[PDB]
Amino acid sequence: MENFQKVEKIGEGTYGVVYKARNKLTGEVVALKKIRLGVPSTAIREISLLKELNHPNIVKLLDVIHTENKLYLVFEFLHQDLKKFMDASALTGIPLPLIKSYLFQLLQGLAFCHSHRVLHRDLKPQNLLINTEGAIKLADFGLARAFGVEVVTLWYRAPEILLGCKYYSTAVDIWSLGCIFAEMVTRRALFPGDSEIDQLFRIFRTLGTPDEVVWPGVTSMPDYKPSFPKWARQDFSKVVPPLDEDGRSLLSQMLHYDPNKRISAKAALAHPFFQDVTKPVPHLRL
Numbered sequence: 037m038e039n040f041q042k043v044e045k046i047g048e049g050t051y052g053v054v055y056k057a058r059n060k061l062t063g064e065v066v067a068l069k070k071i072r073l074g075v076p077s078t079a080i081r082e083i084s085l086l087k088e089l090n091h092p093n094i095v096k097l098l099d100v101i102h103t104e105n106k107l108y109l110v111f112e113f114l115h116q117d118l119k120k121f122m123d124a125s126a127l128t129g130i131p132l133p134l135i136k137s138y139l140f141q142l143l144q145g146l147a148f149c150h151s152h153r154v155l156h157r158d159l160k161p162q163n164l165l166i167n168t169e170g171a172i173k174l175a176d177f178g179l180a181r182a183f184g185v186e187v188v189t190l191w192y193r194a195p196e197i198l199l200g201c202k203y204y205s206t207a208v209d210i211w212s213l214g215c216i217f218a219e220m221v222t223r224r225a226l227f228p229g230d231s232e233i234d235q236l237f238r239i240f241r242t243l244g245t246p247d248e249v250v251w252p253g254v255t256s257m258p259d260y261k262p263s264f265p266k267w268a269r270q271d272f273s274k275v276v277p278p279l280d281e282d283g284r285s286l287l288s289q290m291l292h293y294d295p296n297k298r299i300s301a302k303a304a305l306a307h308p309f310f311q312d313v314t315k316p317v318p319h320l321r322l
């Protein structure tokens with residue numbers, strides 16, 4: 037902490053406060069995360085694996101500073117988060133070519149992470165960071181599993197997590213990114229639940245209550261109740277106007293109930309929606 041001069045608080049998360057800060061020696065501007073708490077050995081080792089998980093669409097973890105039994109993560113600083121950008125673009129909407137670019141890049145980032153068996157587990161607009169050059173990057177990648185631990189947003193949570201599955205798969209991240217894709221397009225959160233059951237029931241109201249036909253094994257999950265109401269599925273035509281039919285096909289594959297049926301990041305990259313992908317420049321007010 038002594039090595040940095042705090043500039044301003046930029047986030048408050050489950051695992052600690054994040055500051056924009058400047059390195060006192062070099063003048064580098066960084067994001068400094070003070071991890072909330074000595075540090076268990078296992079957390080140290082998992083975080084140290086994250087230091088080598090480098091990709092253009094993953095926020096670079098510059099240093100892990102484990103001293104005086106405190107843990108600080110030093111990240112490269114990005115200039116804005118997707119939440120703030122979405123809120124800024126709410127009059128006209130993020131142009132589709134930019135949406136498509138951001139989706140494609142995030143899919144590249146996930147394919148890379150997934151290929152190393154690392155999951156995010158908590159994708160949401162506040163953890164997607166953008167720059168002036170057109171890039172978008174996944175932040176706080178791998179921290180949920182490293183640490184294992186003011187209101188938690190449930191809006192992006194996959195249904196298998198809500199239904200009590202103990203072992204997460206890479207599919208949880210595809211589900212979350214699907215939710216975010218929809219939200220960019222419509223300018224409203226797809227499933228804005230305010231409790232676990234409200235989140236589950238908002239999913240069920242839109243995609244239909246899952247059963248053994250669409251999700252074999254669903255009825256044996258830990259928090260599945262035979263008493264859940266049975267709602268009929270809606271058409272994606274009603275869920276995300278004015279997404280074009282390729283966008284809609286791809287979304288539907290990202291939002292399959294059965295995580296085993298849900299598209300992988302790798303497969304998503306070859307989807308016809310990306311045949312005309314480009315990399316536009318956003319208009320950022322900093």
Ligand SMILES: C[C@@H](O)[C@@H](C)Nc1ccnc(Nc2ccc(S(N)(=O)=O)cc2)n1
Nearest residue numbers: 046047054067113114115116117120175
């Ligand atoms: C991921 C989350 O913990 C975030 C706080 N972490 C990081 C990491 C690296 N860089 C940033 N920058 C940053 C963040 C938000 C904004 S905001 N809310 O003004 O759009 C402007 C810049 N944030």
